[PDB]
Amino acid sequence: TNRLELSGIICRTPLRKVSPSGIPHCQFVLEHRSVQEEAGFHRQAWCQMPVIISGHENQAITHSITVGSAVTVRGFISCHKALSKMVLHAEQIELID
Amino acid sequence: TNRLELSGIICRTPLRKVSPSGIPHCQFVLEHRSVQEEAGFHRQAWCQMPVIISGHENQAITHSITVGSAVTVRGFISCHKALSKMVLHAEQIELID
């Protein structure tokens, strides 16, 4: 199992990237803030999550999202060592604007 | 929205912590490895995710998990700046041993 669903505001201008051999991607940073419940207590949760969306099929989304967009993203997480930097690979995104 | 579900192997010995004013916690590191699908391609996903489980109610789980346990955890993520270090606050855990 590997599934993250996270909402937030895009806080960095999205970067469009195209690979010569197909497979283009769009990367951005999603800032999440919420109140969560833990052991009976209500505490603040905050994160700035790198997000990537790949594939020709998804090329449209990039030109419809920008900094300040309210967005909910669902995908898998993957990490690489710097602790290790986390990226959310988005399978789906929903807009709230 | 803020929900992560992630399976893996506990790769660091769990640390039991009790606060004097109630609210005890148990922290550990969960190593995830899987094949995920992205833009048609099958690629490896890997992460070493800090996990915390809080509350008197959950005090038992700690003495039933150890390094090498296969485990699936579901909760919310929260981050703090070092990029920012991520922690999974577990609302529920399921064992696979």
What is the topology?
Two copies of one chain form a homodimer.
Chain A: E1 2-17, E2 25-38, E3 41-54, E4 70-81, E5 84-95
Parallel strand pairs in A: 3-5
Antiparallel strand pairs in A: 1-2, 1-4, 2-3, 4-5
Question: Can you give keywords for this protein?
Answer:
homodimer, OB fold (Dihydrolipoamide Acetyltransferase, E2P), 0% helix, replication, prib primosome ssdna binding, dimeric, primosomal replication protein N
Using the alpha-carbon principal axes, give the shape of chain A.
globular
The largest beta-sheet of chain A arranges its strands as 1-2-3-5-4
Rg for CA atoms of chain A: 14 Å
The CATH superfamily of chain A turns out to be Nucleic acid-binding proteins
PDB class: replication
Keywords: replication, prib primosome ssdna binding
Assembly: dimeric
Entry title: The Klebsiella pneumoniae primosomal PriB protein: identification, crystal structure, and ssDNA binding mode
Provide a descriptive summary of the structure in words.
Chain A is an all-beta fold and 97 residues long. Chain A has a single domain (1-97), classed as Beta Barrel (OB fold (Dihydrolipoamide Acetyltransferase, E2P)). Chain A has no helices and five strands. The first copy, chain A, has a five-stranded mixed barrel. Chain A starts with a strand and ends with a strand. In chain A, 24% of the residues are buried. Chains A and B meet through β1, β2, β3, β4 and β5 of A and β1, β2, β3, β4 and β5 of B. β1 of chain A pairs antiparallel with β1 (2-17) of chain B, so a sheet runs across the interface.
